[PDB]
Design a protein around this ligand. Structure first.
Ligand SMILES: [Zn+2]
Ligand SMILES: [Zn+2]
Ligand SMILES: [Zn+2]
Ligand SMILES: [Zn+2]
Ligand SMILES: [Zn+2]
Lengths: 362, 362, 362, 362, 362
């Protein structure tokens, strides 16, 4: 008869769905009666069971509509349109909070009665991660203030370390905790703009394993990253705007995003060094290594490189007033859940274990 | 009057047809009275003789529509919308089971009333395959678990061996048993990424015949494939996601898929070797070659390279509960079939014939 | 019923919105009863809280339209149609005044009731800037007349100096004060034209840090930029029109725009030198650097690189009749504002503080 | 209600408007009542005030139309269609006359009561230009006959001279007087077709500053123009047609346009020299130089390089019967205006001045 | 009311108009009352004054249509649909006759009541041409039969000679007499195919000035054209079909067309020589050059390079039955015309004048 384009757009907006084919796929499942809906009955997908009923009617009509694709388009352009609006109107903190709400959205599910996640294992992760660096929760917190504040010449951290030293792991967790893209600058000085363009509208950036020509004896490859980074002093300290290339042209003109530079121990030009407001040296630690050997589940379930592991660390160490007013009530909610589940002594034993190199859950 | 776009879509989703021109051409065959259709009477194509009846009416109206291709476009987009949903909602074991179910549909027809396949020649294929490697049936089960469990740093197998040793054959059947694309890393470090993008949305990948440097004294061409793999540690052990490309622009981001590397015996760098959790050395065997010389059908009919020969082996060796609940009813059904046609001593003789290199069927 | 495409276009032309997705997303915010809109009550975004009322009705009908993007496309095309007319019908002084009027709208909000800007920190910016160069305020007026008069062979200024001398900062504020793109001539003689096309329809251009040959003994990278400029005598002094490119094909033909060349102290060919009607030598000064060291806000808040700091200086120094009639009413309005908040002795002390290198605000 | 697509097309055709965005922009201004139209009241734009009234009604409806863009398209295709018709049907003289009418169209405005042009200054231009070469008006006239006659092997003039010798100026004026494009052939023998394609449908062409390898001692660069010109003998003498490349393919097949070759004093191969029916040597003259020094307005208002300066010279020296019947009445109109404004003696003093090197208006 | 798309198509097919913008612009001229059309009264363009009457009505309705270009698109597509049919259904002799009929339509106007052509100057062209080669009129008939018979290994003629010997001229007229494109094989072995694709659907091809290696001692530039031709034995003698390209992808497959190779006297490989069934050596002659020196019109009006001069020669020399039946009525008609204006002794004197090198018309 007459399908509602606005009812579909609603579904898209509340699913943060920007995929046309995916939107279409999702919506066509609601055409069946939800009465004997197994997907709902078995609560296998939030993006499904939480909306099937309110959409049955519409979906059933959608199923007999001649331009399903076109309808989905507008619903998607609406989501992309909202994302274009937040880009130009939200403060970075508001940005960071939406990110947090999302990661939290997952946690409710992962750790929910339907999820498969073992919260004990994810708290074994906080403990391990908390042994990777001194005052790690204060370290994570600062990075955040740094990223949110995005202040000229004080927005880049340098993670310098060997290999299997932690930098890659922590940068990965931080990357996921804040949102953002990793970038490879060890490339042809001309096939560079290509990658730099990936930074467009990204909250923070991570230049992974930058390599330098200088240095070779100690077994480190060549690469031109360090060389290139030094030619991007304007993108790094962000005093003025910059033009980014994507789609094979000149799209956005913006302040280049703040972030991290993961490095393997080369010689860094003073002109480049001056670009980083903080530098962390990661040195391999035996107990941390053995510990993993005996705590396989940490690597096997990709827990220590999860920004979710880092969001749990903040909720577990940090005070509520440190979060954005808007989210606090949801954090408190979690603290209580977490404080009802683990005693400080249990957690402390976990760190003690990581310390003696024997797997957190012993 | 008014063509039912819905029905056409139903046929598309039932035939799993993702090709617009292929769908169009097939639906239009139904426009003729089935009350005489020889294609149906003679049961020529299941994709036809199982839907002609139900679709005559609507197909008859279809052939008189002024925009049949637009209709098929939506039927197809719907098929792709589903393949997109399952791409994110289904678990790997479910992905595997769907593959399985699809191979069984193929088997139902091959060995059915209106089919050509000679099941005796296909068990001969299993017999030959179960002589190629020790505990071969445990190897395939193991491989399947490795691929489904998809655990960081334990997702790749390395098949090494001269030409005509069997790694290519098993690697092919394995590919078809699981679904997935083969890739070629023997390209210029810049042509790589295009290829690596092929793995997008894939279950598993097979790096076909990687070439190394060193060994040209033993008559082996120097290539950069090995060298590239060592620069793909990220992709191989997949501890964190990665960005894949196509259409000359970035598409999906994900955990590179797990898989196999087929190699010809070049020396391997210890850093690369470490990415393989398992290595299988193939050596050409005389009796196996002699067996084929006296059993041409195994090659001419491409049986020992077929993933169906591997699904068949599983059904023949493996215990029903080792399969997913959902599919067991269909498996027990095939075991019975098989058991009712082949005794253990008969199958046992085939293996004996291969051992003596004379002709599985002698 | 029937969405009013006209109204949507009116909003677009009033918001000066040339982005389709940005327009769509914003108009759709109005679909909610303003009789409660917190975005309005809290006066979050002027682009919203000044039109929600007037557009509720129509936006409410808009959200129920089956082709919102097509509507926005026309709204946008209309905005571009105007930017195209003024491109040919407006005089340079009018072009400049429009720029000015736009910077004042930005200032009205920055220093308004619902804004963050700290005007005291912005006059401190002016104080620091009026110490960077002698008779700085006469320099900006001069520059503006040069740019508006746009006279052949008297349209370019050359800023020379080491790094951190101030040419980059002034050149940035100047750019933003006038509008226009920066270009990079440090490219292969064939990659040039693409870049040169960027200047199309622009008011002025800024050739950022051109590099020469000679001087590598003083630690300066050899580049071909200078060399290229000498091959662009036509563009620089613009006595006759030129053909500019984009989209990989020839577009507009015109007088290349006037502008600035920022350079690092390479020797200049007498033929090139002649194209510059004015040259400004920047030398890093100690007190100015010390001033910033004790006045972080000037950098962290990007004040001394802002074109607003220059418009602010003009308003503070220049006589009202030196502006275009049309804009004077708005200028006198700002002078009063300023005069009512800062006495000459206060502003005079700031300049004194910079001289002593201690903190404009001490 | 029902907008008139033909009324908009009229507007486009009488504005010679081929710009869609521009057409749209122009037309949308007529939607407002012309009663209090300031643009009209102030007569600021002919393309506006001369048509606002006859279009009010239509424009007001156009403003509420849903496909303004589409309407404008057809109106533009109509103008492009008319231009395609004149290409294949007008004699070159008719072509040259339309050009003249247009330049005249401007003159009425420049020198009208609304324009800003000083006719005395533009007559100072004729005088100066008339001192650049002997019998200059007869020279200009001939060139025209040459260009209009476009006769095999008698269609190319060679302007050979140093620098700041006049050739560039006169070629620029001639270029504008007749219509046409400038071309750079000092390029890669393969990136040549690119430029040559610009000549498509052009009335005449000008190869600016062709450079030759031969010659270097006298301080002249290298370049490959002379080299290339010699490989285009077929494009130059135009005995037979040629294929031009634009849009990155093979568009038009036509007789290559006639024109000028501006050169800097290299060695010209006899085979190339034979390509030019006339050759003019320009040698720097002191009085002409000083004169400009004292007659800045000539260069500052881009008067001496204007084809308009050259159209004024013909109207002032040449007899009416020398013009096309169609335009004569309009020229006579101008002669009278000019003869009413300046006495032969006043003009002669102007030349005398240029002769004594002291600025024409002394 | 309702524009007649059919009529517009009829005009297109009658005008043979395959250009959309050209059709649009022309049909729109008919929208004015023909009851006054000066273009008609003055008989300016046959494409106009022969259809204005019949199309006023419909063209008047056309100018008020909301999608004129869409209408013209179909008119054109229809013209191309016909050119496509005849491309496969017509015989070569018919292809040739159509060409002929088209050249006669051109001649009917050139030498008609409302035309400029001076037939006496065109017979002078024939006289000059019939002195360029012995039995010239038999040569053209021969060539035509060769081209129409299109027999494997007997389809190509080779014109050899210095510059200004006549091969270029005859080869040009021959091209225009038959229709077909010229191609340039003096390209890099990889750029070849693009060019070779030009010959698609063509009647004949002319390989313009092929260059060889050897002879640089006689002042002849080394090129790879000859070398390429030797690698095109397949194309040249066409015993079997070939694949031709365009739009950066494979199009038509066919017998490469027959044609001429114009060469400058480079040595030829015996394998290449064999592909030419006929060779014509041109040597510059003094009397012929002197004739032109005293008969400028032959060059200035491009007469001796015109295919019309060759059709004219045929009509003047050849017996009526040597033409196709269908066209004979029109040929006898031209013979009479000619016979009624030129006596044999008059034409004979022209040939005598050329022999003495004095001016065909003396
Ligand atoms: Zn459901
Ligand atoms: Zn059937
Ligand atoms: Zn609001
Ligand atoms: Zn007006
Ligand atoms: Zn007419």
């Amino acid at each position: 008869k007459q399908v509602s384009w606005k009812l579909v757009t609603e579904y898209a907006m509340e699913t943060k769905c920007d995929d046309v084919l995916l939107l279409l796929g999702m919506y066509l499942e609601f055409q069946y009666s939800f009465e004997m809906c197994l997907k709902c009955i078995k609560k296998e997908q939030p993006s499904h069971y939480k909306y099937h009923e309110k959409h049955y009617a519409n979906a059933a009509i959608f199923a007999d509509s001649k331009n399903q694709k076109t309808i989905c388009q507008q619903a998607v352009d609406t989501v992309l349109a909202k994302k274009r609006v937040d880009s130009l109107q939200l403060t970075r903190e508001q940005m960071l909070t939406n990110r947090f709400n999302d990661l939290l959205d997952r946690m409710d599910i992962m750790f929910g009665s339907t999820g498969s996640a073992d919260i004990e294992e994810w708290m074994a992760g906080v403990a391990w991660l908390h042994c990777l660096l001194p005052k790690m929760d204060s370290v994570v917190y600062d990075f955040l203030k740094c990223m949110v504040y995005n202040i000229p010449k004080k927005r880049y951290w340098l993670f310098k370390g060997p290999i299997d030293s932690g930098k890659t792991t922590l940068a990965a967790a931080l990357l996921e905790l804040c949102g953002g893209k990793a970038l490879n600058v060890n490339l042809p000085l001309d096939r560079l703009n290509f990658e730099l363009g990936v930074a467009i509208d990204q909250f923070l950036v991570v230049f992974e394993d930058v390599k330098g020509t200088g240095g070779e004896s100690r077994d480190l490859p060549s690469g031109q990253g360090i060389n290139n980074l030094d030619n991007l002093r304007d993108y790094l300290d962000g005093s003025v705007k910059v033009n980014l290339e994507k789609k094979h042209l000149n799209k956005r003109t913006q302040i280049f995003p703040p972030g991290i530079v993961t490095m393997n121990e080369y010689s860094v030009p003073k002109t480049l060094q001056a670009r980083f407001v903080k530098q962390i040296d990661f040195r391999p630690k035996d107990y941390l290594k053995h510990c993993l050997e005996r705590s396989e589940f940490l690597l096997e379930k990709r827990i220590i490189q999860s920004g979710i592991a880092l969001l749990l660390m903040l909720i577990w160490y940090r005070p509520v007033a440190e979060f954005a007013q808007s989210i606090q009530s949801r954090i408190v909610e979690w603290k209580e859940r977490l404080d009802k589940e683990f005693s400080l002594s249990v957690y402390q034993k976990m760190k003690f274990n990581v310390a003696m190199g024997i797997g957190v859950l012993d």
